[PDB]
């Protein structure tokens, strides 16, 4: 059974750490930080890792009931699974699948439906993933909303993420921090069952990042969001689950007009990409271009300079 | 090469007419109205129809610059491509790909980044797809918002859909109208290049609907949203593009525990599903079950009663 990556241009694909389209390809040194994202983690032979799931529209969503915190505009959400069933914290995963894997304040809307009469309500809401009340592994988080009396108890409530905000009083672009993992269990304990951090081991190589720009909803947020794998690649690897003939798959980025190769790269079995380049660089690509698996290569294969 | 459908449970798949997951399966008589959605339309041999595109996060989103309308809290948006390039009306499609294909008020958030200093802003917004200002084919739509003086001109603005609303002063669930196509060019002319309407032509058959519940943001909306194909099926068919051996593909819905078949259905080459049943029915399915392609059959194959 032959390994493949889907024939999809960068802009046709979807970011795996936030429900938004990919925009561009970026590479740079990653020594000054720990690249350990938990969403968008999948092996080429079809093993989902960390908190990665299949649905691109369920990333950074939250479902459950809410209870008002007296004298505030905040609500505690007791988390439920996507199918509105009881969340199970004993499962061997870092957090509920699709849980945000970066520290920062995410804004969207809390919506709610009253089961008895079909009445509905919706409000802007913010969740702080670096907050002490952000404890999804324990099954509980907190929102700041625009209301203080509207949301009802014991009723299905959903949070739909839109973008990220930033306290404009602090240094510009100081949040969100996309390479800092939240403490899924808050102050209670350390993170568990994490997908491993990644780094280029072969000299002269850097990680290839699939970049999007998260929408900003307030302040001066850092809107860069990089993932190791497009969500479609995750979905594809899970379905196909083809055997890896090696630890490294040689991909060629190709222009379908002529077949000419813009550059080549290494897709690692454990699920990330490296290129042969040194320095920060926004890759300039033909809009119709796409990745093409050509062969399995030795782990210590020397790429052509990007 | 062989035709297939993805191995995904219903709840693991995404509604193709709105960026939310699927929840259940439904069948009902559809004579009293015209079923002609333009999103979630694809042939089994891989031809996209209507306004259908590949990414599920792009359904019912809008990108462009906005202009305030004197004396109101409304804004006109001059539409752009997903990649912020100029939108082209002359392309032979009904509207920009991903455009809402029902009539009703969709509520979400308008966010905006100021190119110069990186400042951002966000407000609740509703687009009324049934009114005259909804002219996406012409490259212009209009939003009702919370703000009055906060959005800037000449700046990248995005609309992120969340749910739908309804006026409680009227009969409950009287909007939205999911089977009523909006006029993509307003009153300037009729819709063009539409995907054809679908109706069971075989005696004893009804359409099978992939049903989701849209979030409600105000009032008592009708939150049923039905598509003819999951978004993953669309993505799959587009990639695979296997030749159709006949106009009808037989599918079995199986429980992977035992391989036991719950029901069979017809996946028509033009991209929709029928079952053998009369009357409205919510299909009771095991949550691990999925569709499996078994064989190409004669057009006039008689399904077993579901």
């Amino acid at each position, epitope marked *: 059974k032959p390994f493949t990556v889907p024939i999809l241009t960068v802009e046709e694909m979807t970011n795996s750490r936030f429900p938004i389209p990919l925009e561009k390809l970026f590479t740079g040194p990653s020594g000054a930080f720990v690249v350990q994202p938990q969403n968008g983690r999948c092996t080429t*032979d*079809g*093993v*989902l890792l960390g908190t990665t799931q299949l649905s691109p529209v369920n990333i950074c969503t939250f479902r459950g009931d809410v209870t008002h915190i007296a004298g505030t505009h905040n609500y505690t959400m007791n988390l439920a699974s996507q199918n509105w069933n009881n969340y199970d914290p004993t499962e*061997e995963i870092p957090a509920p699948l699709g849980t945000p894997d970066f520290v920062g304040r995410i804004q969207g809307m809390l919506t709610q439906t009253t089961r008895g009469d079909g009445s509905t309500r919706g409000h802007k809401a913010t969740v702080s993933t670096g907050d002490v009340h952000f404890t999804p592994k324990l099954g509980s988080i907190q929102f700041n909303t625009d209301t203080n009396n509207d949301f009802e108890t014991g009723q299905n409530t959903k949070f739909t993420p839109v973008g990220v905000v930033q306290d404009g009083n602090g240094a510009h672009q100081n949040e969100p921090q996309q390479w800092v993992l939240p403490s899924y269990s808050g102050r209670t304990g350390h993170n568990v069952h994490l997908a491993p951090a990644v780094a280029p081991t072969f000299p002269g190589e850097q990680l290839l990042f699939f970049r999007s720009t998260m929408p900003g909803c307030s302040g001066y947020p850092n809107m860069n969001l990089d993932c190791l794998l497009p969500q479609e690649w995750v979905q594809h690897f*899970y*379905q196909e*689950a083809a*055997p*890896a*003939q*090696s*630890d490294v798959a040689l991909l060629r980025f190709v222009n379908p007009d002529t077949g000419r190769v813009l550059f080549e790269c290494k897709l690692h079995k454990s699920g990330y990409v490296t290129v042969a380049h040194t320095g920060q660089h926004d890759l300039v690509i033909p809009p119709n271009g796409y990745f093409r698996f050509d062969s399995w290569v030795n782990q210590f294969y020397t790429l052509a300079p990007m | 090469k062989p035709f297939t459908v993805p*191995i995904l*449970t219903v709840e693991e798949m995404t509604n193709s007419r709105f960026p939310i997951p699927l929840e259940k399966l439904f069948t009902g008589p559809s004579g009293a109205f015209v079923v002609q959605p333009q999103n979630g339309r694809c042939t089994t041999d891989g031809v996209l129809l209507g306004t259908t595109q590949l990414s599920p996060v792009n359904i019912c989103t809008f990108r462009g610059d906005v202009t305030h309308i004197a004396g109101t809290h409304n804004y006109t948006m001059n539409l752009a491509s997903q990649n912020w390039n100029n939108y082209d009306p002359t392309e032979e499609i009904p509207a920009p790909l991903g455009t809402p294909d029902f009539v009703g008020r969709i509520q979400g958030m308008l966010t905006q980044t100021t190119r110069g200093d990186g400042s951002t802003r966000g407000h609740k917004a509703t687009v009324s797809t049934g009114d005259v200002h909804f002219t996406p084919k012409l490259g212009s739509i209009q939003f009702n918002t919370d703000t009055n003086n906060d959005f800037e001109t000449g700046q990248n603005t995005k609309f992120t859909p969340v749910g739908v609303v309804q006026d409680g002063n009227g009969a409950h669930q009287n909007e939205p109208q999911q089977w009523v196509l909006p006029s993509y060019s307003g009153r300037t002319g009729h819709n063009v290049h539409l995907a054809p309407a679908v109706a069971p032509t075989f005696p004893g058959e009804q359409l099978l609907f992939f049903r989701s519940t849209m979030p409600g943001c105000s009032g008592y909306p009708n939150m049923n949203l039905d598509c003819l194909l999951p978004q993953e099926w669309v993505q799959h068919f587009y990639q695979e593009a296997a030749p159709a051996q006949s106009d009808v593909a037989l599918l079995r819905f199986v429980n*992977p*525990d*035992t*391989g036991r078949v719950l029901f069979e259905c017809k996946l028509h080459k033009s991209g929709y599903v029928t079952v053998a049943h009369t009357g409205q029915h919510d299909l009771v399915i095991p949550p*691990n079950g*999925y569709f499996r392609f078994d064989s190409w059959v004669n057009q006039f194959y008689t399904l077993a009663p579901m």
Partner: antibody
Amino acid sequence: QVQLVQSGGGMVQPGGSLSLSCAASGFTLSNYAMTWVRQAPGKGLEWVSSIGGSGGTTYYADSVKGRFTISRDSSMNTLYLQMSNLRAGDTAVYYCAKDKTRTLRLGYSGMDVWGQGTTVTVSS
Amino acid sequence: DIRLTQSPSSLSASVGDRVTITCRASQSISSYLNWYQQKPGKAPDLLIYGASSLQSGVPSRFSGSGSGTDFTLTISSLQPEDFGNYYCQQSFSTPRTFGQGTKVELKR
């Protein structure tokens, strides 16, 4: 405490049928590929049958194709092996085993958790 | 049917000795090779998976190497509890196959 407990087995005349069970604890069985491995008296290990993860699908050694049926029950978190038209070459200790990693169908990892084994004897 | 052939079929060694068991495949199985230890009357125990990864709970003295067709289980310092039968197993493709096994006994 991840664990596989086996039941069933015993002896049966040649041509007869037997059923093996394997109840899982501490993990959801339907999420991992499950395998039946057998060992004849004084012999090595032989692969009998596997079922995939959440997507299922089944696989068989030619020896037992058409005679054996592997299946599971998610509501009981149990794996089953149905054997019929049994012959002397089926006399062995039968083990159920779980794949390390979760997959859609049949994966490529080793088997990290094992049942204690059930004895099957086919004799007149 | 991918055939796996272990070498040797049996060995004996003193405590502290370096023990090497090789497995050769009839065709390339990439790195999808696993090693098991079986005590008599007991279920096998996963030692090495993916040719070179140490299963948790397994002592550091066990180690694996190789890819394609040729693989090696190595015990850096043989211990009395390491007695038993060792099986290599490929999971590259169905039918899943085992080596004929290797008997490891201790001298004293």
